[PDB]
Each structure stands twice: as C-alpha cells, then as structure tokens.
Design an enzyme around this catalytic site. Structure first.
Site: not given
Ligand SMILES: [Zn+2]
Ligand SMILES: [Zn+2]
Lengths: 45, 50, 39, 33, 100, 335, 243, 49, 101, 200, 67, 48
Positions: E69-70
């Site tokens: 979850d970048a």
C-alpha cells in the site's frame, strides 16, 4: 499610499498615526491594509 | 452578558435568507451550536453518566 | 559583549540550522554554545 | 571436514551478553490459562 | 480506520473561508464531488463543498516502488494541478499599555 | 509465430519480438535496409487540421514506442514561465492563476525563437529572440443598464468574465517586422480564466519562453499521442441460425454483419472493434471464433494542442531521433 | 547502515529489511542516529551492521527475506509455462544487475524448432553468474502447498504441481519459489544457505540482485485483480445455497 | 491489553537478568564473579549459529 | 568535442574488446529500448541489454557482449550507425505520402 | 499564506480505510496507456484486497466507470444502492469489458501485458500530516536548565529520547563504547573535580 | 472554484466548455450524458472533469468587500 | 545502504581530525562552505 480601508464601509482613507482606530463614514472598527502597488514576481508551475 | 450559541432564536442568524447572512458574511452550510468566547470558537460536548 | 580574538562589539545569533550559537561578525569565532533556555 | 568446521564454529564464544539476548528472545508477542 | 481519517480529509471549509482568520487552516485548490455518492451525504450537503477528488486508478504492481500500500503517480498530473493544497496560518500580537 | 498476439479470456501470448537472427538454427531475418524498404509501408487515414490518423506496417514494437514517447517528451513548445504581477485584487490569489496562465496553449511554433541560457544573470538572460512578452489589463465595473434582479451577471457587470482573448500580445523591438504577418494568439481564445466583481482589477504581464515537454507538462505540444494494434477475428465454423443475431449484438454494431444471401455472419469494415471479449463468456462460441491481434499494424492517432500541425511534430519526432543517435557517433569513448 | 545522499525529502531504505522493523509505510516515522567518535563508528558496523545480522538470535532463522510481493514476482518467472527467447533472456538477465556483472549463457532447453530457455535457468544465473563466482550450493526443500505424489512408487519430485524443489550445482532442477524456498520463517531457505557456506558478503550480493530484478520486471509483465477473479463462478452459488 | 503488558513484562525480567556474560573458561557467571551454570545448556554452544 | 557521454567502464570490461559496459548520460528508455533492437539483429552479438540504475539520477548503462569475431566496441558503432539509416527510410516513405495525400 | 505540491511522503487515503504514502513520482512516458491513450493517475498494488477484504473498492470502480460513460452519477448506499448486473449492461454497450477488466500496453517497452489490467476512476482524498512540517533535525542546540539535556518538542527544536527499551537492545549486541558515547558524550558530558579523601 | 483549464490525465484543454455545458442545459433541455458527447468529450477522463466539478466561485464572490 | 535526504545531510555533522592522508580532501572540502552539500559547518583549531 492607498492606506487602510474599512471592512464593509470600504472607504479609502489615510489614518494619521497614534490617533484613532475607527474609520470615518461608519463606526465600524475593523479595517484592512490595502495591497501595495509594488511589483511582485512569480513562476508558472 | 450571556454568551449564547449560534442559530438559537436569540441570535440574529436565526431564520436568515442568505442575504442578511450574505451581509453578515456567514456560511449558510454552517451547522451552528457553539460559543465564541473571546475569539476561539468552542462547543460543549454531550456527557452521560449512570 | 567582547570577543576574545577581534574584541568584536556586535553579536549575531544564527537561527538557520537551529544551532542558536552566538558568533561575532568580524572573524567568525563563536562566543557561546549549547544555549540554556528557561522552560 | 565441514561437519566439524560448523560444529567448532557453533561453539559459544566468550563475551556474549547471553543474559541480555535471552531476556529479549523470551519477550515477544477442565481449563487453564 | 476511515471514520478516524474522514475527519482528517482536506477540502473546502465554508463560503466565508477567504474571510475568516483561524489558527492553522488548509485548503484544496481544485475540489471535486465524488462519483459514487450516498443518500447520507446529500442530506448534509457534503456534495455542495466536497473534500478530495477522483482520479483514474490502474491497480497493478509497477517498478517495485509500491510493495505494501504505497502509491505511484505521474509528474504530469501534478503539473496539470493534481491536488495542490495550500496552507494558511494565523499569527497575532497585542499592543500593550503599561502603568507609566 | 505468425506475428499475432493470441488473446483469450484470461491471457495474451507471445507478445515479444522474435525477429532476430540467433532465434532458430536457420538464422533468417537478418538486417537489410533494402529488404526492409520493400516491406515498410505508410497508410494515411482521415487527415485534417488539429488531428491526424495514419498507419505504419511491419515494424517491431520497440521503435514504435520511442516515437510515441518522444512526441510528448522532446519536441518543444512555448508557454508562460515567469508572470510579473501588478495590482491584483481578485479573489483568485496570485500563484493560482499564474499557474493557470502557463497551461494555455499558444499558436506560434518553435524554431522562430532560440533556447534561453540560464547561466547568464537575469538582466540580459531574457534576450530579444528567445522571449516574447504578453499582458492584459482588465477592471470590472458596474454596467448601468436596466435589467431586473437576479438575472445574468453578464449585463449587470461589464467584462466580469475574462477569457484567453484578453491576453494582448505586446511586441518587443526588432521582431515586429518578423511577427507582422503572424500575430500570436491562444489556441482556444474562449477559455474561462477568472471571474470578477466591480471594484476588482487584474493587471500583469508574462514572459513565455521556449521549453521542453520533458521538463514540465506546459510545454508538451501534443494533447495525447497513442497507438492501437489492428484486431483480427478468425472464424472456424460458419455460424448459422439464430446464433448469428446473438453473435451480432455482442459487438460494436458496424464491425461484423449478416450475409443477406445465406444466414451466415461475416466481417464488415474492420478497425472499429474495441476488444469487448464478450464472445468468450457464452461458451457456445468457444470453437467458432479464434480471434487475435496483429503485431505489426499500428493505428497512430495524434492530435495537437494547437501549436502546429499534427503531421509536423511526427516529422519532427523521427528527425530529432536521428539527431539524437547521430550526435554520439561523433564523440570519443573515454575509458 | 551505510548512507547515500538523495535529493528528495524523506528516508529511503531497501525494502527487504522492513521485516525486522515491521514498518507499514502508512505515515510511520523513524529516527536515525550518528555516532561521533572515530572508534564507535567502527563499533556499529562490526556488530550492528546488517551483514552480521541476517539471522535472528531468537532461533537462528534468517529474518530478512523477500516480502509479500518479491515472492510473486519470482514466482511468475519460475512458473513451468514460462518460456523465453534469447532477446528477452538477455533483457531479464540485464535487469538483475546494472549491466556490470559479466554472465555466460547456458544452452537453451527447447532446441530443435527454435531455441527456448526456461523460467528457471534465468533464476539459476542470479545465484551463480559465471564460473568466476565461487558460489555453488546443494539443497532439497518442500514448498508451501506440496500436493503429494502417488507416495509409494513416485518420490517427492514427481508431484502433480511442480512441488518439491531440487537444486544441484546451483541450477534449478524442479520446484517453484513460494515463500518457503526463498522467504522467511523456514530454516531451509536459499538465502540462508549462501549465508551459511559463503559468508555474509555474498549473501547480500545475491539477494539484492533479485530485488533489482523483481522490481523492474513484473511492472512490465503485468498483474492485477478484479471482480471476475473474485466472483463465484455460479457453480458455487447452487452448491452453497443447499450445503 | 497486551502491548502494554508485554513491553512491561519483557522489561521486568530484563532487570533481574541483564548481566550474565561468558568468561573465557566457557563458563557463564554473574557480574559479581559468581557461578550460575558451568556450561550454557548441556554443552555450551551458540544458540543462533 | 564533448566527453560527458558514453564512457566505458574499466572495472567490468574484458582484456579484449569482446565484452564491455558503457554508461550513457542524459538518455532515458527512449534511446535504450530502440538501441537494444537495432543491435540484436547483428548475427555476431549474443548479449546486449540495458538498465537504469536509479531513477532520481539521470544516466543509462548499456551492456554489450558478443563472440570473438568482432570487438563489441566496434559492434555498437555499427549498431548506432545502423538506426540512423532506419530513421531515414521511415522519413522518406512518409514524406512522399504526405505530398501525394 | 503558502501552497505546495504533493511531492512524495504525503499521506493519502482511499475513503475505504487505506492509509497510503506516495512512493515516487514517475513521468508520463513511463506510465502505461489504454487503446485510446488514457494515462492513469494513481497506481496501487493488487496486494491489499485479499488481506484487507475491501470488496467495496472493487465494486465502486465498476459503479464509477459505467456512470461516466452514461453521464449519470450513481448512488452508493448502505444495505442497497445500485446493483452489479444492471451496471455491467451499461459499459458493455459502450464497448469495454463486462467487469471493467481492461487491457493496456506498457509505456516502457511498447507491447501488451501478459495479464489483464483493472481500471477506472476512484476517489482519492488527501489527508493531513504532510511531510514539509514534520522533517526536523537537532545537531547541537538548546539545553534544559535543570538537566542540560535536549529539549523535547519539535517547536522547541527537538532532540529525541533514546529510551530505556533501546538501552537494553544495545548491550544485547555487547557493544560497550557507543553506549557511553550516545548517553554521555553527545548528550550529557560534564566535567567534575572530586576529592580523593572524604570523597565528594 | 473555476474549472481546471486542462484535463488531469491526458491534458487537452477544457476551459471553453464549462459555459457551453451550462448553455446546453438552460436552453435545449437535454440529458447530460448525450450533451457533452455532442460537444466532443469522447475520453471519459475528460468527462469526469465537468461532471464532478462543483463551481464554488459563484458562492464565494457574494462575499466581496467592495459592496 | 539507507538513503538520506540532503536537507538533513547538511545539518547532521561528523567530526574529523586532519591527517597527512586526508589533508588534500579537506582543503577542497572547507572551501565549499555551509551552503553546498559536501562541505563543513564548524571548525576547531587546536590552538583555538
Ligand atoms: Zn467606514
Ligand atoms: Zn575528597
């Protein structure tokens, strides 16, 4: 010059210093400094 | 002097028509219900107990 | 008020990198280090 | 050769604070608890 | 996790927001109403002054720079103005009269 | 092989080049410019102003992509870079609309000017042949006509809405002889730029210069440059009966049609199908149609922002790629 | 760690060490320290350098590994139906380094129709780039799934899937890599073994060669998720509604 | 309920046990030079290696 | 002339010109993808790939590796001379279809 | 007054409870593109949806894309709202895939991608906690009047607390030389003359 | 505020079309989906730039300090 | 290797005694000043 202007009276006036804090033409006591005439520079990004 | 909440029937914002409130430069979408003691705007929370 | 090398009379405080050291203007020698604030 | 090169290397060297590493190795996240 | 973050979303504030002088107050330059609305949000008129904007997502792995979850976005859309926020900050002082 | 990407319900296949000697034992398809000159072809589709469409045949996907990248990377254009402000009492604050000035297209082309040199100090850096200056001055006032209340605020207030046509070009010296025949304009002079109330005025002048699209998105001359690959549909068995009308409604309407002689579906004018892959769901056409995509057909679709003709940048793309690759042929190899 | 100066405004670390720090990249902030002697600067490398601490003192297990998508990058490469020509085998092998390490190409698997390398010999080269590299290993391990063979006549290698993994002389001979072969948790991993028999220096040098590959690779191969690959296929609908 | 106690529990026994080092006779002993056990475990080898 | 350009790495080269590794300044994937394909159609070369080390800095590394027939430094000099002709044959074919329309 | 551009570090959200920080900033050439050439804005990896079980973003992106081509805004309510099977009928008439699962070329090499992509417009709202006013560093600054220690608080120039839990982790390495250096040399060095007899 | 001059993703200009979108709704009572597609917004990245755009600059200008 | 941004890298310093080995580099380093990256901030002569 174009000194202090009022909030809603919106009347251009030049207050002489250490004399009053109100404006003329209305008893309203919040007044704004107007924008200078001096040139300013920006970019476009 | 009694500090009174906004949108109550004693304040001037009660039943405005976004024209008085245009002249009084307040947001029509503001909920109201908070005090303006000496600047900063505060609100009393809803407490509970046993 | 007086530097040790050039005996400078004016002191400038550097707030750029927040060291807050006090340096004389002429020769650049520091007058005080590790400031002691009153919390 | 390597079966006693790994055995001899696996011998505990002196100076290791084995109390410190053991304390932190054990600390990690009808009926009886 | 969202209801704790929904209070931290940036967008509009009020119609008089160019007039009030508050302590540390952010704005978004180009806000947009969301695409998938709710019957809830049209009762509080969230759509009349929203927070945040809807962009075109392509969910995929790319260049390894998004592992867990970048996010990965392009230099052009920021250069076209993708969410240029703006920080307004008050500071004050009082002229004070002494006993003499 | 057969240079067809084999698409299906969950994958595509063999998308790579496989066009090199050393791939099989017999080393065919070696490099020969004359054997490429016989095979290369350019089809031009509907061509007009502001927009182009044209085909390229028998090319590997490698150098087709570099054409798409360079057209929005390297070919320069002109946009605002420094906005000198005067008195400005709008509600739109200063660096917001000064960002919006640079994103307005300009009709004038590059090669009429030169690259600005940033090593010089900013008093002679803005020369007479790399920098042209434009400005606008507008003050909204009351329009003293007689409408009734709450009507259109275009006749209550004169010039309340400003547009791109308000940007008056002010020529510098030595170049009014050059730009006499060609005045410069925004590519779309109807763009809304700001709104005003009476008592509010905007005054500024801008320095638009020559810059590269890879630096910033102002300078990209293209709206967007892309390419498709031609879809190909191969039918195994002749579809007969009611299935053909079921086979027709699962497409764009013009790509395939029914034969009116005998009840059989055939392929109409192609290049109008986007790959909806709806035929894969119905499990009754799993053997009738084996569709694919040819790995050498390229539907180049470009369109300009307004700077120059779309065929010119495409000519400019392949020209500077040569100049990119010829430049390092004439420099020594340092150890 | 060693430092490297970069012009942005935040701390950038290599991803494979995030498992000791259990960071989540969601707004967590770290703090860095710097020693200020000429003696304690030498103290921090020779004991607290990451080359000395691939193994946890809790059990002796290799704690730094491939995280939750470096496996699935190196999994689609080692899939059994992954075949490559020379032109792509060159480009994949050129992205695990920065064009610096000299390689030698083994002969391809499929040879008569065309020359085809497999998706495993490319993985064999990131371990042993050439004969000048001293690394050669031997290892037998079980995957995470490992559907069993006929279990009495067939040995572990002849699974229905690829399953049981065999490497001899540092070439892939069977199996895939699914977080039990190259990842964390299990003792008998690949990165454990190069740490075991070739020191710490070659252990880091062989696994960042994976990181520079699997980052640059599968963003150009492609992988996504959606409704059709999360939806019930309508045969789970009539079966669940009665069971 | 656990993150508060575990960091507190892994500090409690850390205090009582922080100083036990192996001397060059392969014998671990406390800071006051007193024997706790003669070899670490049955044989005295590194548990991580 | 200039020398802030293609520059052979002495650390990763062979004793002969059979294998080398060059470092291109100020060129992104726009050149390296094109230059890879024009080289691979040489029958002499066996290995020619490229990579970007780190996208914050701006440099490209092209790798070249061939058999003992030609030195690899001579191969890309043939290689990057060869696409210069390929730019022409597209330009010549295209511009005659424009004027014909 | 100041404004700023969303460079990397800035915490974004997704309105379904996904914290997220900008990793890098690519250019437009490196980005992929569909058949029409539409370049996506934000990239997220598919590796969140099995763990976080966020089905809502997987169906909102379908509910969003079909509404744009129909020109109509779609209602997403709790315990109801617009369904799926009536929504797939809209965009399949427009010609796209029947569940938004499109395919698009790669911007870095040109050719197709072996798998299919999932695509559409989603609503990414920016959060607080931008990074331009969290980066701070205290090299050698002000000291407390009672302890000669660095001053807690970024607005009071900072100087971080090497706490008691880190002090246990140093001696587990067995390093004994930076332990004094990080706790009295760079922090609290003070020179005291003491008498030998009657020692104080 | 005012409409963004370009699109976010592709970047063709939409600044001449906000007033035309409003003018295509006072007169010629029409569906919004077929309105801007007639105007020439084929890409749906362009279509969301005008659907979602709340125009707060009308509501801001009624708080002018100039009366 | 960890990456460190430069705006914190030209604040956090590290002391360095001069020797005959590193005299050549530190002369080029001290002329940079505290504005470009590879420079110095403070200095202490042994007589000072
Ligand atoms: Zn007044
Ligand atoms: Zn004494």
């Amino acid at each position: 010059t174009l000194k202090y202007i009022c909030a809603e009276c919106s009347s251009k006036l030049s207050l002489s210093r250490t004399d009053a804090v109100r404006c003329k033409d209305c008893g309203h006591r919040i007044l704004l400094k107007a924008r200078t005439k001096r040139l300013v520079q920006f970019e476009a990004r | 002097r009694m500090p009174i909440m906004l949108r109550s029937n004693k304040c001037i914002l009660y039943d405005a028509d976004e024209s008085k409130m245009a002249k009084l430069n307040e947001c029509p979408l503001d909920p109201g219900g908070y005090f303006i003691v000496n600047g900063t705007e505060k609100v009393i929370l809803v407490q509970e107990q046993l | 008020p007086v530097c040790k090398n050039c005996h400078g009379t004016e002191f400038e405080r550097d707030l750029s990198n927040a060291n807050n050291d006090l340096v004389c203007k002429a020769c650049g020698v520091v007058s005080e280090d590790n400031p002691i604030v009153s919390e | 050769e390597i079966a006693l090169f790994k055995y001899r290397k696996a011998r505990l060297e002196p100076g290791t604070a084995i109390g410190a590493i053991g304390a932190q190795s054990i600390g990690e996240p009808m009926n009886v608890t | 996790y969202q209801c704790a973050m929904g209070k931290q979303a940036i967008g509009a504030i009020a119609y008089n927001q160019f007039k009030r002088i508050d302590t540390l107050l952010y704005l978004m330059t180009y806000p947009q109403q969301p695409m998938v609305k709710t019957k809830t949000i049209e009762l509080i008129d969230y759509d009349k002054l929203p927070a945040g904007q809807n962009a075109t997502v392509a969910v995929m792995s790319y260049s390894g720079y998004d592992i867990e979850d970048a996010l990965v976005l392009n230099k052009s859309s920021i250069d076209r103005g993708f969410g240029r926020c703006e920080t307004r900050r008050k500071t004050t002082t009082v002229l004070k009269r002494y006993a003499n | 092989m057969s240079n067809i990407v084999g698409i299906e319900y969950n994958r595509v296949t063999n998308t790579t080049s496989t066009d090199f000697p050393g791939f099989s034992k017999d080393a065919e398809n070696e490099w020969n410019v004359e054997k490429f000159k016989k095979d290369f072809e350019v089809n031009i589709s509907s061509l007009d102003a502001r927009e182009a469409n044209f085909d390229l045949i028998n090319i590997d996907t490698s150098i087709a992509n570099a054409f798409r990248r360079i057209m929005i990377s390297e070919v320069p254009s002109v946009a605002a870079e420094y906005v000198y402000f005067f008195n400005n009492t709008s509600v739109i604050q200063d660096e917001v609309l000064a960002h919006r000035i640079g994103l307005v297209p300009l009709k004038v082309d590059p090669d009429m000017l030169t690259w600005v040199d940033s090593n010089l100090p900013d008093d002679e850096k803005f020369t007479d042949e790399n920098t042209i200056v434009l400005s606008l001055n507008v003050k909204c006032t009351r329009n003293p006509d007689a409408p009734k209340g709450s009507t259109d605020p275009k006749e209550l207030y004169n010039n309340a809405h400003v547009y791109a046509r308000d940007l008056k070009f002010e020529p510098q010296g030595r170049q009014s002889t050059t730009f006499a025949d060609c005045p410069v304009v925004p590519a779309d002079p109807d763009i809304l730029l700001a709104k005003l109330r009476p008592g509010q005025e905007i005054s500024l002048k801008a320095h638009c210069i020559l810059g590269i699209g890879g630096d910033h998105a102002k300078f990209s001359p293209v709206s967007t440059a892309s390419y498709r690959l031609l879809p190909q549909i191969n039918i195994l068995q002749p579809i007969k009966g009611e299935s053909a009308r079921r086979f027709q409604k699962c497409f764009p309407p013009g790509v395939i049609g029914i034969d009116e002689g005998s009840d059989e579906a055939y392929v109409k004018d192609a290049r109008k199908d986007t790959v909806s892959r709806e035929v894969l769901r119905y499990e009754e056409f799993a053997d009738k149609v084996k569709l694919g995509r040819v790995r050498n057909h390229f539907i180049f679709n470009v369109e300009s922002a307004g700077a120059m003709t779309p065929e010119e940048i495409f000519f400019k793309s392949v020209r500077i790629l040569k100049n990119k690759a010829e430049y390092l042929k004439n420099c020594p190899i340092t150890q | 760690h060693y430092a490297k100066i970069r012009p942005w405004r935040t701390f950038r670390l290599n991803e494979c060490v995030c498992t000791p720090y259990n960071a989540d990249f969601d707004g967590d902030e770290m703090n860095l320290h710097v020693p200020q002697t000429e003696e304690a600067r030498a103290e921090a490398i020779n004991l607290m350098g990451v080359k000395n601490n691939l193994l946890t003192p809790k059990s002796g297990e290799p704690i730094i590994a491939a995280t939750q998508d470096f496996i699935t990058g190196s999994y689609l490469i080692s899939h059994k139906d992954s075949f490559y020509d020379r032109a792509t085998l060159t480009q994949l092998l050129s992205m695990m380094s920065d064009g610096i390490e000299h390689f030698d190409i083994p002969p391809p698997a499929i040879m008569k129709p065309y020359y085809l390398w497999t998706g495993k010999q490319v993985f064999s080269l990131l371990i042993k780039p050439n004969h000048n590299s001293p690394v050669v290993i031997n290892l037998d391990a079980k995957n995470k799934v490992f559907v069993p063979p006929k279990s009495k006549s067939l040995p572990n290698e002849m699974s229905q899937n690829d399953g049981f993994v065999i490497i001899r002389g540092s070439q892939i001979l069977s199996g895939v890599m699914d977080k039990s072969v190259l990842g964390d948790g299990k003792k008998h991993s690949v990165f454990y073994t190069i740490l075991r028999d070739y020191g710490p220096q070659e252990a880091a040098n062989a696994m960042n060669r994976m990181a520079k590959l699997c980052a640059r690779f599968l963003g150009n191969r492609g992988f996504s998720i959606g409704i059709n690959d999360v939806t019930p296929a309508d045969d789970l609908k009539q079966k669940k509604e009665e069971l | 309920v656990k993150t508060a106690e575990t960091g507190y529990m892994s500090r409690r026994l850390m205090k009582s046990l922080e100083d036990l080092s192996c001397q060059y006779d392969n014998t671990v002993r406390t800071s006051a030079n007193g024997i706790v056990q003669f070899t670490y475990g049955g044989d005295g080898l590194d548990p991580l290696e | 002339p200039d020398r802030e350009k293609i520059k052979l790495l002495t650390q990763a080269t062979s004793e002969d010109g059979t294998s080398a590794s060059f470092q291109i300044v100020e060129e992104d994937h726009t050149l390296g993808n094109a230059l890879r394909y024009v080289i691979m159609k040489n029958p002499d070369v066996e290995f020619c790939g490229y990579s970007i080390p780190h996208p914050s800095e701006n440099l490209l590394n092209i790798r070249i590796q061939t058999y003992g027939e030609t030195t690899a430094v001579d191969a890309l000099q043939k290689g990057l001379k060869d696409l210069m002709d390929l730019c022409d044959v597209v330009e010549s074919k295209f511009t005659e279809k424009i004027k014909s329309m | 007054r100041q404004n700023r551009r969303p460079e990397l570090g800035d915490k974004f959200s997704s309105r379904h409870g996904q914290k997220g920080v900008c990793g890098i900033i690519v250019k437009q050439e490196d980005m992929p593109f569909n058949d029409q050439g539409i370049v996506p804005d934000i990239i997220m990896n598919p590796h969140g949806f099995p763990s976080r079980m966020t089905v809502g973003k997987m169906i909102e992106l379908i509910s969003g894309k079909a509404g744009v081509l129909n020109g109509t805004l779609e209602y997403g309510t709790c315990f109801g709202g617009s369904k799926l099977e009536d929504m797939s009928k809209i965009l399949v008439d427009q010609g796209f895939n029947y569940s938004g699962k499109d395919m698009l070329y790669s911007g870095i090499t040109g050719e197709c991608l072996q798998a299919y992509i999932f695509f559409g417009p989603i609503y990414y709202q920016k959060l607080k906690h931008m990074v331009l006013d969290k980066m701070h560093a205290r090299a050698r600054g002000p000291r407390a009047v009672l302890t000669r220690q660095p001053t807690e608080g970024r607005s009071r120039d900072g100087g971080l607390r090497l706490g008691e839990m880190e002090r246990d982790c140093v001696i587990a390495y067995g390093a004994s030389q930076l332990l004094l250096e990080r706790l009295m040399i760079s922090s609290d060095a003070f020179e005291v003359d003491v008498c030998d007899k009657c020692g104080l | 505020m005012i409409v963004p001059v370009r699109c976010f993703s592709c970047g063709k200009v939409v600044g001449d079309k906000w007033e035309s979108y409003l003018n295509l709704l006072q007169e010629d009572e029409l569906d919004e989906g077929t309105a801007l597609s007639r105007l020439g917004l084929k890409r749906y990245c362009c279509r969301r730039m005008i659907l979602t755009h709340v125009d707060l600059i009308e509501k801001f200008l009624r708080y002018n300090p100039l009366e | 290797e960890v990456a460190v941004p430069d705006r914190v890298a030209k604040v956090l310093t590290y002391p360095e005694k001069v020797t005959r080995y590193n005299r050549h580099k530190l002369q080029e380093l001290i002329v940079n000043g505290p504005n470009v990256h590879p420079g110095a901030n403070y200095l202490l002569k042994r007589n000072e």
